[PDB]
Amino acid sequence: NLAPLPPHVPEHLVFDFDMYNPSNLSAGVQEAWAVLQESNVPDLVWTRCNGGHWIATRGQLIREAYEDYRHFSSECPFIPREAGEAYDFIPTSMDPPEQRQFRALANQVVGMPVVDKLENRIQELACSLIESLRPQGQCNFTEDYAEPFPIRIFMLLAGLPEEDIPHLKYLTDQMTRPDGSMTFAEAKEALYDYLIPIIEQRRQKPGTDAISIVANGQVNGRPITSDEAKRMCGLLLVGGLDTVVNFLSFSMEFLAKSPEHRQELIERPERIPAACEELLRRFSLVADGRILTSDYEFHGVQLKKGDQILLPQMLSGLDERENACPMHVDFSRQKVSHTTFGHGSHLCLGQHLARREIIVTLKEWLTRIPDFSIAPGAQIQHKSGIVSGVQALPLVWDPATTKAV
Ligand code: HEM
Numbered sequence: 001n002l003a004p005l006p007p008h009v010p011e012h013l014v015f016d017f018d019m020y021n022p023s024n025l026s027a028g029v030q031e032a033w034a035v036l037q038e039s040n041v042p043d044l045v046w047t048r049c050n051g052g053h054w055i056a057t058r059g060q061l062i063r064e065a066y067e068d069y070r071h072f073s074s075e076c077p078f079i080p081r082e083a084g085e086a087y088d089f090i091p092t093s094m095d096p097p098e099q100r101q102f103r104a105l106a107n108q109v110v111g112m113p114v115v116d117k118l119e120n121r122i123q124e125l126a127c128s129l130i131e132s133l134r135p136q137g138q139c140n141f142t143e144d145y146a147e148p149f150p151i152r153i154f155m156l157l158a159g160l161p162e163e164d165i166p167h168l169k170y171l172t173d174q175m176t177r178p179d180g181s182m183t184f185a186e187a188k189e190a191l192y193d194y195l196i197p198i199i200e201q202r203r204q205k206p207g208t209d210a211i212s213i214v215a216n217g218q219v220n221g222r223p224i225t226s227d228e229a230k231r232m233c234g235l236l237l238v239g240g241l242d243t244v245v246n247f248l249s250f251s252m253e254f255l256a257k258s259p260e261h262r263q264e265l266i267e268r269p270e271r272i273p274a275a276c277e278e279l280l281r282r283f284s285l286v287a288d289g290r291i292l293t294s295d296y297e298f299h300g301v302q303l304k305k306g307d308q309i310l311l312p313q314m315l316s317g318l319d320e321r322e323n324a325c326p327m328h329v330d331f332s333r334q335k336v337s338h339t340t341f342g343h344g345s346h347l348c349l350g351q352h353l354a355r356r357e358i359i360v361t362l363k364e365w366l367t368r369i370p371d372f373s374i375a376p377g378a379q380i381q382h383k384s385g386i387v388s389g390v391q392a393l394p395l396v397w398d399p400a401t402t403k404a405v
Pocket residue numbers: 074077090091092103106110235236237239240243244247285286288289313340341342343345346347348349350351353354
């Protein structure tokens with residue numbers, strides 16, 4: 001389902017990539033997207049799927065487009081258009097200077113200082129979930145750890161019931177990796193019916209949870225409105241209920257397959273921080289974009305006002321011009337260049353939180369279960385969209401090789 005080519009698009013710039021169902025999916029999701037960086041592909045392409053939009057394919061252009069908020073606006077950041085249009089999350093659907101006051105607030109709730117405080121719980125939950133898995137010699141890493149781990153730390157942060165997990169998880173999934181089951185606006189609305197009451201309650205009777213802090217915060221010397229809070233909190237939820245979860249499975253899937261990688265981390269733990277960045281580069285997973293606010297000529301191509309462009313965060317560090325041998329995982333690379341957490345004014349607030357959850361999981365898992373592999377006859381399926389993921393991750397191990405702590 002290709003849309004008829006708009007007049008301004010040079011036909012030699014057409015490259016029909018489906019962000020929602022790329023061609024090489026079976027070989028892996030990052031591998032599927034990297035086709036855009038082969039030699040036959042121009043740097044800035046036009047795709048006809050998903051209603052027609054541009055895709056920047058190079059580190060350099062993505063960074064530039066991200067830096068340039070004047071031309072490339074966060075007003076409509078999701079593709080297809082109907083979705084970018086219904087998108088009203090804060091601070092994500094706003095441009096500087098307006099964006100800045102809301103970011104300052106969200107930062108309060110997820111910043112370094114909050115992570116610093118939640119550390120022992122992170123570490124505590126990891127050790128617990130692991131040790132519980134250990135003696136089984138088998139899990140579904142996706143369902144058994146990848147989801148619980150990050151989700152429960154978030155529920156805790158927000159002060160929301162663990163019971164709510166499934167519902168929230170399905171609505172998040174429809175936003176990022178649309179099923180067909182629900183339009184973006186419907187998913188958005190339902191997350192919203194969920195939050196409203198909770199926000200009301202916390203305006204009235206404040207706690208110390210992230211929601212109460214957002215609900216009663218100040219933006220530009222005045223109190224935030226209800227709609228504003230609803231809209232920040234909605235982002236906070238989806239923000240992490242989805243990204244960390246998928247990142248862990250990609251990383252774990254790689255670890256299950258690379259014995260020498262695990263060993264390296266076991267013998268030289270000083271290297272975990274470095275390995276973490278390398279995994280962030282190699283298993284990068286987000287893809288969103290921007291809307292053109294006017295006619296503008298970028299890298300020789302004519303962008304008409306209203307055009308949407310996909311600026312894949314995923315692709316910058318997979319770009320050979322940026323990283324030599326990009327598909328190879330090397331924990332000792334001199335410079336790990338990525339834009340996994342984004343670029344420009346919208347750089348991820350939650351990065352500190354995500355790195356802490358990543359490092360803990362790796363140190364913690366390797367300690368207890370140093371030797372594990374993918375289950376025999378398991379076929380791992382990746383999925384694509386705004387946030388790419390792993391469907392399920394069957395792992396097997398010999399209990400006798402574990403170590404209880
Ligand atoms: C592996 C994990 C994560 C990845 C890969 C990631 C990726 C991203 C990216 C690429 C952006 C920028 C999007 C744009 O410029 O439109 C972003 C923004 C954001 N992320 Fe993260 N994220 C991760 C984890 C989290 C966590 C754990 C949270 C906390 C709930 C979160 C909250 C946010 C927020 C609040 C913003 C918006 C910042 C602003 O608009 O100024 N993310 N993230």
